[PDB]
Write a protein that binds this ligand. Structure first.
Ligand SMILES: CCCCCCCCCCCCCC(=O)O[C@@H]1[C@H](O)[C@@H](COP(=O)(O)OP(=O)(O)OC[C@H]2O[C@@H](n3cnc4c(N)ncnc43)[C@H](O)[C@@H]2O)O[C@@H]1O
Ligand SMILES: CCCCCCCCCCCCCC(=O)O[C@@H]1[C@H](O)[C@@H](COP(=O)(O)OP(=O)(O)OC[C@H]2O[C@@H](n3cnc4c(N)ncnc43)[C@H](O)[C@@H]2O)O[C@@H]1O
Ligand SMILES: CCCCCCCCCCCCCC(=O)O[C@@H]1[C@H](O)[C@@H](COP(=O)(O)OP(=O)(O)OC[C@H]2O[C@@H](n3cnc4c(N)ncnc43)[C@H](O)[C@@H]2O)O[C@@H]1O
Ligand SMILES: CCCCCCCCCCCCCC(=O)O[C@@H]1[C@H](O)[C@@H](COP(=O)(O)OP(=O)(O)OC[C@H]2O[C@@H](n3cnc4c(N)ncnc43)[C@H](O)[C@@H]2O)O[C@@H]1O
Ligand SMILES: [Zn+2]
Ligand SMILES: [Zn+2]
Ligand SMILES: [Zn+2]
Ligand SMILES: [Zn+2]
Lengths: 286, 287, 287, 272
């Protein structure tokens, strides 16, 4: 019945090495990019939502709300200036997903992040569902124009403190983040309907799973599919680590980078991971 | 529209005297502690990175990487023995920041240094973002223990050439430095998100700004905010001293202590600064 | 005549949410800082005035009287040693006023306290009438000198049990408290004459309203202005909570922190308030 | 003028034997109870759940934790009974305690001897201000172990143990004692505390500059004490076990046998 021999990281690692673990889905969020210097959303003191006071919003969520944006874009672009990283360097956790890809294990990475770090780690477009879009490209908001602008144009406007206006039609230009009030990307719908029918392992990292419909994804997997959480805290998506009925869900509590190193060590991959991280970090820094 | 009347130290000092200049942020590195007997990292011949061959490292950065530390901690602690100062005596530069604090000008000092000298100079923790942590406290590496050990305990282990181990759990004890591979302190995150919205002056001292995310901090300030560099050389993080579009950045090239004395002179603080330094140095010497 | 739909905290909260209430004045005393470890003045056994025997004063008030201070400063500084707080950590009540500022509802906080916790909570100089002055700054008492000294300087003197003397003239150095016999701050008179004519709500917290002229402020608002008292006991004057003629005054009897938490909950601000308190308290606790 | 002849336990004992040392204040924390099998709650190996407004809405988590953390027995240490002997010899002005484990009361310190800084688990009170009914340790325990949320037998409001929850005021006795105790204290005895948490940590700096201060603790306390510098004149650190420090001090005062006898008989009485 139970696919894992025990509900521990060691059990997960032994299952990953067995013949039946062939397709892996990663589900990630802002916690996997904190060690790259990008704050998460909900951590006390450090998270974005604990640092919005000086933007004098009518309510905290307005700064990521499409209707507020169209009326008052200034706070969002001020925030962009304060958070824009100035180097885009993926974490150990990101490179662990790259190893999954290189060893033919990665079916998909579902990400709530907009930082583009999955791509920089070497995950290709087909490997990814960018459920919140991306900062990488920007567009005029007018549906009858939709002129595209690259990262270098948008960055220029952000750091010069000029509100991005479209060069054709003078409408606001917005990064391709899915703001509150905008539709999810088509790839979310297309990929979610097939990926979870036949997946052997879910790896949930650096997310509190507080936002639908992303949170519901883990429940779509087969009943027998083991699920591993690598996170600072127990997240709020129907995982059962503790009950008498617990049979497939494992939590490793701590930093995403440490958890990925620990899992890599059990798999015999730790040296390869650390070499990959060193080489890519060295390259990005040069 | 340009907040400085000219791109000189005199210009910065006059701006600093004006009503508009109320909140100053200092951003500092290892250059401000070389006159306190601690080498910087990147200066040719004298800096730490030109003096690592004898430690027989796989690559230079290994000695400050958490993963290498956990495996082979000996080189780090042998290095700690060679660099640990005989006394902790802040510089003129550190006491200049103390003056900024006492005159109600200092919003924050962001430091890359681990030497605790900002604190010894009388900057309180509230005034500081210790971006690389501190040597002042140490901790057991085990997440399920984290037994705290003071400077005096860590110092004794270093000079007796015994690798620091936990008294409770026998795992490695590490100084609270942020090694390569470790997360930045929480306070960097929280302060970084508010301090740079409303800042009137940046003072960048004794740093080459080669390392992210610290280097990006100066670009978070308003476009209008004047920025003064006091450093031996131009820093390698988006400042524009020399181009035809230069409007707000000023470089004073030389020793940090000398620049701070020059600025203090222009502000009418030189005698007060010199008297504070003399007093505090005598007091520390007397211990 | 009746701007509140009922004389309850819930009525006050619905009035505050409406368009009718745009300008709030807070009037605060020592009760808002008891949970921050500073005693109040009048409470039996626990209050400051019940604990003055050991200072062998000619009479209770002498310790806060300018003329007695100049002749015998020592009891004041020994008292300052005993009450000086371990940290300056504002209470939930302080941060509730911070919320009033951030939502554009705070016309003014009038404070009788000298503990500086309104400032530390993030209320700016412009939001405040510091009616009793402040411990934050100190001055030489001599009119022809008036050298200013910072809190750190004053603390050092307090804990070393050396009476503060000015470095220039050797006159006594006094914290900027408005001692008895001293003129009231200019801001008290100027703000009163424009604030109380357009106030929509008075929030009276942690004060017995026993001392004049501060107590009289509550009668300066228009007769239609609702007034909420959040205090352990009914304040001893002018306010009518209980008679058949009662129409605008509401008492919430209990701890200021708990009263403010209750009011915030009714307003839909509980989480916003608690998040703010938590992040500010965590920051201060890490010094 | 240094009140100690030397900065050692022996110097402290000789000071304690002089007519000058009449009034002792003990400042204690979790380190004094770890020998009684009570866990140091701040130790990482060994916040709504302690907040008053959350408790009134969701009390179950607190009482589930109370069931788990409830000690097998309340059995004070050699250290606690050293304080009992200080009381019995007329030396104890006050014990200021950070612990809620009640071991001071069981050791025979009376409420008049005590300032419980974070309150006490010994008594419980109904949350209604218009009722405020008191309940003993024995009643609260029965509620905790039956896994029924305790309600008041008169008004059906929540009954809460007298721990000072977050968002509650400091106790009255903190204010009334703190304002007089430290002006006339002759010796501070700080035991089993790191002195990192405020406002408790600041209590030691309220004593006069001349007042000797003895630290009995495993480590140096991390709030403004000077054992080592060439200016050191009054602070003494005895490093090791609180029980062993107290035995060694008792021995120098000629109290060791009395202390041992008290400990043994009380331990026996409690076990029975
Ligand atoms: C290139 C950057 C440019 C800057 C421009 C700014 C644009 C900001 C992006 C707008 C995003 C759209 C609006 C929005 O608010 O989306 C949010 C977000 O997409 C969604 C999901 O949130 P999420 O990704 O789950 O992030 P949370 O902050 O809610 O949770 C993170 C979790 O991880 C943990 N954690 C933290 N750090 C670590 C670590 N190092 N190791 C292990 N775990 C870690 C935390 O304990 C926590 O459980 O909820 C929110 O609608
Ligand atoms: C307290 C006991 C000490 C012994 C312990 C030794 C352990 C060392 C711990 C190292 C921390 C690990 C990670 C690490 O390597 O951090 C480094 C560092 O924190 C970061 C930033 O580097 P930084 O602080 O900018 O230091 P640099 O050496 O790169 O730059 C110093 C700059 O200043 C200039 N300069 C020099 N002297 C003067 C002077 N007197 N006046 C004016 N300018 C001066 C130089 O010309 C140069 O531009 O880059 C590196 O990751
Ligand atoms: C920062 C360093 C501090 C140490 C320095 C020491 C110097 C401080 C003395 C400054 C000199 C000022 C002279 C002076 O005596 O001013 C006094 C004072 O400013 C003025 C006004 O008195 P007040 O602020 O109204 O203080 P009271 O004690 O008269 O009344 C406090 C009220 O609050 C209540 N209460 C208590 N706790 C709570 C609580 N937690 N929740 C709710 N309510 C609470 C009490 O029940 C009481 O009704 O009358 C007096 O001249
Ligand atoms: C019971 C029912 C369940 C509900 C209970 C809910 C709880 O607040 C807390 C409290 O105010 C404060 C206490 O700080 P504390 O008592 O100072 O505890 P610390 O951990 O900070 O200090 C413990 C010290 O002691 C030492 N120690 C340890 N054992 C020994 C020994 N045998 N001999 C000598 N020394 C010992 C250690 O070496 C350490 O230095 O920390 C926290 O905020
Ligand atoms: Zn367009
Ligand atoms: Zn340990
Ligand atoms: Zn003077
Ligand atoms: Zn009751």
């Amino acid at each position: 019945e139970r696919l894992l021999d025990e509900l521990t990281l060691e059990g997960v690692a032994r299952y990953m090495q067995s013949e039946r673990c062939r397709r892996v889905i990663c589900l990630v969020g802002a916690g996997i990019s904190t060690s790259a210097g990008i704050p998460d959303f909900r951590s006390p003191s450090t998270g974005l939502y604990d640092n919005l006071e000086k933007y004098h919003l009518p309510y905290p969520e307005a700064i990521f709300e499409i209707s507020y944006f169209k009326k008052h874009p200034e706070p969002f672009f001020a925030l962009a200036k304060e958070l824009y990283p100035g180097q885009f360097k993926p974490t150990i956790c990101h490179y662990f997903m790259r190893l999954l890809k290189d060893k033919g294990l990665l079916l998909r990475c579902y990400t709530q992040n907009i930082d583009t770090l999955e791509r920089i780690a070497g995950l290709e477009q087909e490997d990814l569902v960018e459920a919140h879009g991306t900062f990488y490209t920007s567009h005029c908001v007018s549906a009858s124009c939709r002129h595209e602008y690259p990262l270098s144009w948008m960055k220029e406007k952000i750091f010069s403190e000029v509100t991005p206006k479209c060069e054709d039609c003078q409408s606001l230009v917005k990064p391709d983040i899915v703001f509150f009030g905008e539709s999810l990307p088509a790839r979310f719908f297309s990929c979610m309907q097939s990926d979870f029918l036949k997946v052997d392992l879910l790896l949930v990292m650096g997310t509190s799973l507080q936002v639908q419909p992303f949170a519901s994804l883990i429940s779509k997997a087969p009943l027998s599919t083991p699920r591993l959480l690598i996170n600072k805290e127990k997240a709020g998506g129907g995982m059962d680590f503790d009950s008498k009925k617990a049979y497939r869900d494992v939590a490793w509590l701590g930093e995403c980078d440490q958890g990925c190193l620990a899992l890599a060590e059990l798999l015999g991959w730790k040296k390869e991971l650390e070499d990959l991280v060193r080489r890519e970090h060295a390259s990005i820094d040069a």
